[PDB]
Design an enzyme around this catalytic site. Structure first.
Site, PDB file in Angstrom:
ATOM      1  N   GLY A  24      60.893  61.178  45.265  1.00 51.74           N
ATOM      2  CA  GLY A  24      59.808  61.810  46.130  1.00 51.74           C
ATOM      3  C   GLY A  24      59.935  63.116  46.011  1.00 51.74           C
ATOM      4  O   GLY A  24      60.785  63.800  45.642  1.00 51.74           O
ATOM      5  N   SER A  25      58.848  64.080  46.587  1.00 54.49           N
ATOM      6  CA  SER A  25      59.118  65.434  46.637  1.00 54.49           C
ATOM      7  C   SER A  25      60.112  65.944  47.527  1.00 54.49           C
ATOM      8  O   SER A  25      60.533  67.093  47.378  1.00 54.49           O
ATOM      9  CB  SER A  25      57.571  66.037  46.622  1.00 54.49           C
ATOM     10  OG  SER A  25      57.222  65.758  48.072  1.00 54.49           O
ATOM     11  N   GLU A  27      63.007  65.110  47.695  1.00 52.32           N
ATOM     12  CA  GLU A  27      64.111  64.896  47.176  1.00 52.32           C
ATOM     13  C   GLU A  27      64.332  65.609  45.778  1.00 52.32           C
ATOM     14  O   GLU A  27      65.209  65.791  45.101  1.00 52.32           O
ATOM     15  CB  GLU A  27      64.198  63.384  46.646  1.00 52.32           C
ATOM     16  CG  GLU A  27      64.316  62.379  47.992  1.00 52.32           C
ATOM     17  CD  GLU A  27      63.005  62.616  48.708  1.00 52.32           C
ATOM     18  OE1 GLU A  27      61.867  62.266  48.167  1.00 52.32           O
ATOM     19  OE2 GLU A  27      62.935  62.524  50.017  1.00 52.32           O
ATOM     20  N   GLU A  46      61.811  50.611  47.119  1.00 48.82           N
ATOM     21  CA  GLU A  46      63.158  50.768  47.597  1.00 48.82           C
ATOM     22  C   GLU A  46      64.058  49.569  48.151  1.00 48.82           C
ATOM     23  O   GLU A  46      65.033  49.607  48.307  1.00 48.82           O
ATOM     24  CB  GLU A  46      62.930  51.656  48.861  1.00 48.82           C
ATOM     25  CG  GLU A  46      62.119  53.280  48.390  1.00 48.82           C
ATOM     26  CD  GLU A  46      60.798  53.160  47.959  1.00 48.82           C
ATOM     27  OE1 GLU A  46      60.101  52.185  48.082  1.00 48.82           O
ATOM     28  OE2 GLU A  46      60.353  54.360  47.961  1.00 48.82           O
ATOM     29  N   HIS A  69      63.174  58.335  49.507  1.00 50.95           N
ATOM     30  CA  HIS A  69      62.041  59.256  49.903  1.00 50.95           C
ATOM     31  C   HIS A  69      61.736  59.116  51.295  1.00 50.95           C
ATOM     32  O   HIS A  69      61.030  58.309  51.921  1.00 50.95           O
ATOM     33  CB  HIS A  69      60.643  59.231  48.920  1.00 50.95           C
ATOM     34  CG  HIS A  69      59.609  59.984  49.597  1.00 50.95           C
ATOM     35  ND1 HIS A  69      59.719  61.274  49.653  1.00 50.95           N
ATOM     36  CD2 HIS A  69      58.501  59.719  50.364  1.00 50.95           C
ATOM     37  CE1 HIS A  69      58.803  61.915  50.399  1.00 50.95           C
ATOM     38  NE2 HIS A  69      57.837  61.040  50.905  1.00 50.95           N
ATOM     39  N   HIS A 280      73.966  28.660  62.088  1.00 53.73           N
ATOM     40  CA  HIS A 280      72.837  28.801  61.520  1.00 53.73           C
ATOM     41  C   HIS A 280      71.803  28.038  62.710  1.00 53.73           C
ATOM     42  O   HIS A 280      71.482  28.342  63.657  1.00 53.73           O
ATOM     43  CB  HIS A 280      72.669  28.770  59.993  1.00 53.73           C
ATOM     44  CG  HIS A 280      71.302  28.880  59.659  1.00 53.73           C
ATOM     45  ND1 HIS A 280      70.161  29.010  60.453  1.00 53.73           N
ATOM     46  CD2 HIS A 280      70.875  28.448  58.297  1.00 53.73           C
ATOM     47  CE1 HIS A 280      69.066  29.107  59.581  1.00 53.73           C
ATOM     48  NE2 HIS A 280      69.376  28.707  58.384  1.00 53.73           N
ATOM     49  N   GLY A 400      70.523  36.461  55.136  1.00 56.65           N
ATOM     50  CA  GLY A 400      69.594  35.678  55.309  1.00 56.65           C
ATOM     51  C   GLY A 400      68.275  35.978  54.608  1.00 56.65           C
ATOM     52  O   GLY A 400      67.486  35.532  54.685  1.00 56.65           O
TER      53      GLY A 400
END
Ligand SMILES: Cc1ncc(Cn2c(C)c(CCOP(=O)(O)OP(=O)(O)O)sc2=O)c(N)n1
Ligand SMILES: Cc1ncc(Cn2c(C)c(CCOP(=O)(O)OP(=O)(O)O)sc2=O)c(N)n1
Ligand SMILES: Cc1ncc(Cn2c(C)c(CCOP(=O)(O)OP(=O)(O)O)sc2=O)c(N)n1
Ligand SMILES: [Ca+2]
Ligand SMILES: [Ca+2]
Ligand SMILES: [Ca+2]
Ligand SMILES: [Ca+2]
Ligand SMILES: [Ca+2]
Ligand SMILES: [Ca+2]
Ligand code: NA
Lengths: 525, 525, 525
Positions: A24-25, A27, A46, A69, A280, A400
């Site tokens: 992104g800008s 970065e 992402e 970003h 679980h 999970g």
């Protein structure tokens, strides 16, 4: 030197050479003048960036570096971070911030309260107070991700920092070596070893940190000396033991009462590299039966603190497994006998039973294949039917969370270019990070994706049965054409509606030179 | 009554009848026995669930209710929450937690430190201390999301709570009415009105909270009485004014110096329903020129606090816009003259210029179309070329976060079944939430998706030019077949490689009875 | 069993028998039926409660248990928690919450968002989701505070939980043993030992975790074998070495350039049990000079990560110091020669120079005295003038926060009833936690408090000089009668306006059977 030059020098001197990213800008000032010795692996969303980096870190057993970003890019990655937190994955997550002069006004693309955004799913989260501090903050991020217990970290960097002058004293960061390779002191280790040597019927339970440490072979030696059965701790993210070794007893059921019943009669249960335990279903009863005591070796203080029973030792799993394997006596008990092969389930000429799919994969895949699992209703059958002899042969989303296996299989294949990766993913799970397929196509990373298409979220029908819950919406996912999705992202695609076509598609996929997706029609639950 | 029955009663009594969700096992005890008067809208990934709910809330001007799975499901949605925070979207985000008896051991699917997970992107975030408290916590969530300034909220609920007995006093929650429909006191309002009546050259700047409040028509009356030019505040998430009204002057440039130069010569600038200001590029200079003063009316204390200049009034935008429009004098200045139509750009028989695409959409779409924008390099042209006469006609990701428009266009179309929704999305942005297409197919929500395919992240090439940044990786996205992705998720798909095919595909899409995706070949930057 | 009975059983089985507290009504259901084998130590304000517990934990080298009232009581203690965080003090801080049925309405005494209140000054912070979970949450708190790196933890408990039935499986918590007593693996330890044996001019720097681990005697053996000078790391919270041993070189200056100049010429600098480094003044220059390399052994990953130079090993300080002391070779270099005694400063018959006070304390106090320091402008002189031969002989507020030494001296005296505690506290610092004096009177804990009364915040005049800062308000504290404050809280009080009266008051205080406060008139800076 600039902060940009100093930071890339620190990264290469610390062994990092790959950036997994979606740009992104904020970065672009970091990514410009990208060094010739680095690679950049683009993914289109992402969750996929972080999943790929996570597979790569887990398989390579080293930190992986990510650039996202601002807040929206970090936020798209936060379900991936939940899994990385529970797998102890050493991920260095960087995100670009607005220029310092407009952070206060909250210009577009400002990551507000940045360090709080990825909490509680990171070990360390920070934005530096000045540009010159950026290399030291990166050094902190590298070491925090890499020290035991490993895990993800986050660093936010204002985009104007990169071109500023670095502190000339930042060179002292480049070659720092930090070790957490520690084991219990000799006197207390001798007490533990005597307890193991004296046990009349010991059991061993292994978790994912054994495979992360590559302690698998030491754990085989330990189980052979103690003549002890070996299980894998429940909800397993990795495979820590050869699954056809005579001591192997399989994946533990993820329930309190089921585990204490399984361990009944074992006087000492040694748990290595696992939480105690990742239950679980709610299956109330005794944590341990009378006559069983538990000792846990864990790299993570949080795991030692929360165990509801047993003693614990907080230390490095590689160092402890090596010491125990080399110090215990050889017991004169008989070695456990190997479990029998699983039975062949009856299969007609129609839709495939999952048992048939795993038996056929076990017949055809190389002995050094690496499997990933995001086929949630078929995990028990997968563990019974795949012979996984080597370390690093199995990954399952540690929290999970759906969306891990598809991208992580690409990162694992990048880390292990000579081992064929085969990701077995349900038709439901395949959607969460579907766009990761594009990265496999673009970089020609030859992962095989086996989509188990039964039209429904099968495990949620199972859990609904356990709860006796009726009239639940949202459990069916009809109407998805996975060969068209694979074509959309440039991956070769095959369909298998019966066993003949499953065998033919696997032969074609194993002979291919790029990634391949096979859509398998499996039986409806 | 059970907590389940009491909570669904509270939701229906507060006007909620739709759950946007992706289910998991901590949520099955909430979703079971789903009431016959509710609907459930499934999406295949949580960024898509939240995006759809966000479009639905913004277009309906009422809260939307979401149910996600634990930490991984919440985390997958956090980039969507960044946009919802900056659009003030009233979203009630619920997530299921483990049973209370296993939270402490951190069983699989436990959302650890749950309330901290979505911070800082929510107004209120909570997990109740007991089952009986759940309906009161839901009541708090409903009102916190709905009071000005509206925004997302988060509630985590242990799965065992639903079947417990509710507090018999929870009935007092069902019909609570909470109002934030407030305006400045009469004496100070009279002072503001006199300042507006006395200005020699006023300007008006409008932001997204005008469209959220449906204050658009009052703002037209205000601009007509003051005879004042009207702009839209930069980085606009919504369209607050008819774009071919004579007073309209367009979208402001997102720069400090550019805005003060634009406003030079205006003695009083009245900003309604916007931050002051959502700048983007760094364009340092004066916030305002000598001779200009600014007054902001905002529903959000955080916006009033951070403005670097001007006076501010924190109040409801609907109530303030109505009062001002009805109290100001009619100025004897001449009404501003309408801006001229945009010029036709030269177009050959090859790939489409974006300007041609927007002109053709403006020619063919109904006058009550609703547009969404995630074609980041073409925003200025879109604002110049689409005549948007009505409220609720434009949405753009308010935090700049990709992945909003595709799912939000489905939620807007569900909220506005008689207005044709047309989402204009770049080939890069389309991937972030691509699986949302499935929900449009499954529920037959007839959104039209126009994919602007130029092969690259065009805006990041633009910003790289602004920074003069070279040698940047990761900017190209070749090799995506969007008609195959649409087929994958069951949506009819068309391609337009030239203007003849663009016109033919739009005619076919506008006549269709279901969702349609058109892949448009646009010129490379 | 009730949660109350089970929780007190867990505490006693884990070695806890004392509650340091200031009570409130959310805590009465915990404190009722107080067990006969426990004691309760009341203090009149929560900074004093936590300070007393902190001294007790640091001197006893075991966790101390605290009970405070809700948010206001916790909040009054948060400056004390800042010091405990930087001293790694194992403090279990509990606070009572409202009854679960009124938490949502925020009744008076509700601790809102409780777990976030003491962050970032705790290792672990939690409120349980049900009453039955309380003993397991307490078990987590005990082990989190006690595992390396030790530190404070926080647990909030709704008052209605105590009388509920406990989980019958909570008995497995009572006897859990958790160890973090670990050291570097043999191969890497052998590499470290060879580097130390090969150094031509090694130096040793020791921090507070050496004294916490009682590793002092092993560090003496190590320095004798290596024939190496020993310093104490800057801003020292504890004394880790005998201050008249021939190797001892004193407290390091708290500046970057000053430390690298001090270490110049030393080829290997081994830091044990300290951050690298707790600098104070900004004294920019090289972190280390060419020719010096640094190795740090620390119990805290955060310290290893943030060091700006050197290698690091994260391990237990007791286990590492013992291993190194027993493995290194005896060097054939000459043992360092002892530093010369400090000079006697000229003293007239008026107000006392601090140097005279410390010389007279060193002449008269027992050889096993324990000193605390909160006389901020006289620290360097104190370190030069007190012969502290034994471990556990010095404490100074580890975060620099006033209000520690007065209460901590009472906790240290309770932990060490046969060692005379002498707290040397400035007239400014004495006010922060003045009411702690009452606890010494009430329980007859015979701490001696020496108040250095110079009328001003002397160190802030010093730092103002360093900054060249003029026209600063708020630096003088005239008009405090410390003998009247001591009388107010029941402590015997003496005044010393000259050296004759200092000697007479110390003789009387050392012969007393209860606590004594001596107000000393010291020279104005
Ligand atoms: C991010 C996320 N969202 C939702 C879920 C809930 N979930 C879902 C949706 C499952 C069904 C996956 O379906 P599948 O087709 O991949 O496999 P099966 O049919 O074999 O269950 S299993 C499960 O826990 C989750 N764990 N993570
Ligand atoms: C979640 C996320 N990731 C990345 C970005 C960065 N980003 C990206 C990747 C843009 C390019 C979008 O490309 P497109 O094809 O959709 O449109 P254009 O070619 O017209 O720019 S614009 C922009 O800010 C972002 N804003 N949000
Ligand atoms: C809680 C708190 N408040 C204020 C300070 C600031 N402070 C103050 C107020 C000091 C002066 C202490 O005065 P004293 O009389 O105790 O000793 P000296 O005159 O020898 O400095 S030193 C110092 O750092 C602090 N560190 N901690
Ligand atoms: Ca290269
Ligand atoms: Ca399925
Ligand atoms: Ca119905
Ligand atoms: Ca594009
Ligand atoms: Ca007693
Ligand atoms: Ca003083
Ligand atoms: Na967060």
């Amino acid at each position: 030197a600039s902060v940009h030059g100093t930071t890339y020098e620190l990264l290469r001197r610390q062994g990092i050479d790959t950036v997994f990213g979606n740009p992104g800008s904020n970065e672009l000032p970091f990514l410009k003048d990208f060094p010739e010795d680095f690679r950049y692996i683009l993914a289109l969303q992402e969750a996929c960036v972080v999943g790929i980096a996570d597979g790569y870190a887990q398989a390579s057993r080293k930190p992986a570096f990510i650039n996202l970003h601002s807040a929206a890019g970090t936020g798209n990655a936060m379900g991936a971070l939940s899994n990385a937190w529970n797998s102890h994955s050493p991920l260095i997550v960087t995100a670009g911030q607005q220029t310092r002069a407009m952070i206060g006004v909250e210009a577009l693309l400002t990551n507000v309260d940045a360090a709080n955004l990825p909490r509680p799913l990171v070990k360390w989260s920070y934005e530096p107070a000045s540009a010159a501090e950026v290399p030291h903050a990166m050094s902190r991020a590298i070491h925090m991700a890499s020290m035991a217990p490993q895990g993800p970290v986050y660093l936010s960097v204002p985009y104007d920092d990169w071109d500023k002058d670095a502190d000339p004293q930042s060179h002292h960061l480049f070659d720092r070596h930090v070790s957490s390779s520690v084991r219990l002191n000799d006197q207390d280790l001798d007490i533990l070893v005597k307890a193991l040597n004296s046990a009349s019927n010991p059991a061993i339970v292994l978790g994912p940190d054994v495979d992360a440490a590559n302690a698998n072979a030491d754990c085989v030696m330990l189980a052979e000396r103690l003549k002890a059965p070996v299980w894998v701790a429940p909800s397993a993210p990795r495979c820590p033991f050869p699954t056809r070794h005579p001591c192997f007893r399989g994946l533990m059921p993820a329930g309190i009462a089921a585990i204490s019943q399984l361990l009944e009669g074992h006087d000492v249960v040694l748990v290595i590299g696992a939480p105690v335990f990742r239950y679980h279903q709610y299956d109330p009863g005794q944590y341990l039966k009378p006559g069983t005591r538990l000792i846990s070796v864990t790299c993570d203080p949080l795991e030692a603190a929360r165990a509801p029973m047993g003693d614990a030792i907080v230390a490095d799993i590689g160092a402890m497994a090596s010491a125990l394997a080399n110090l215990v006596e050889e017991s004169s008990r008989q070695l456990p006998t190997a479990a029998p092969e699983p039975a062949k389930v009856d299969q007609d000429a129609g839709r495939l039973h999952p048992e048939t799919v795993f038996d056929t994969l076990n017949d055809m895949a190389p002995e050094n294949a690496i499997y990933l699992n995001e086929s949630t209703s078929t995990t028990a059958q997968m563990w019974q039917r795949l012979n996984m002899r080597n370390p690093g042969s199995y990954y399952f989303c540690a929290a999970g969370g759906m969306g891990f296996a598809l991208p992580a299989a690409i990162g694992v294949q990048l880390a292990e270019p000579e081992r064929q990766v085969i990701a077995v993913i349900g038709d439901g799970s395949a959607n969460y990070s579907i766009s990761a397929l594009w990265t496999a196509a673009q970089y020609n990373i030859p992962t095989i994706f086996v989509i188990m298409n039964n039209g429904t979220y099968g495990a949620l029908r199972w859990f609904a049965g356990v709860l006796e819950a009726e009239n639940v919406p949202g459990l069916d996912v009809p109407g998805i054409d996975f060969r068209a999705l694979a074509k959309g992202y440039g991956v070769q695609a095959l369909k298998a509606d019966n066993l003949e076509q499953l065998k033919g598609s696997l032969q074609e996929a194993l002979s291919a030179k790029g990634p391949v997706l096979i859509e398998v029609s499996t039986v409806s639950p």
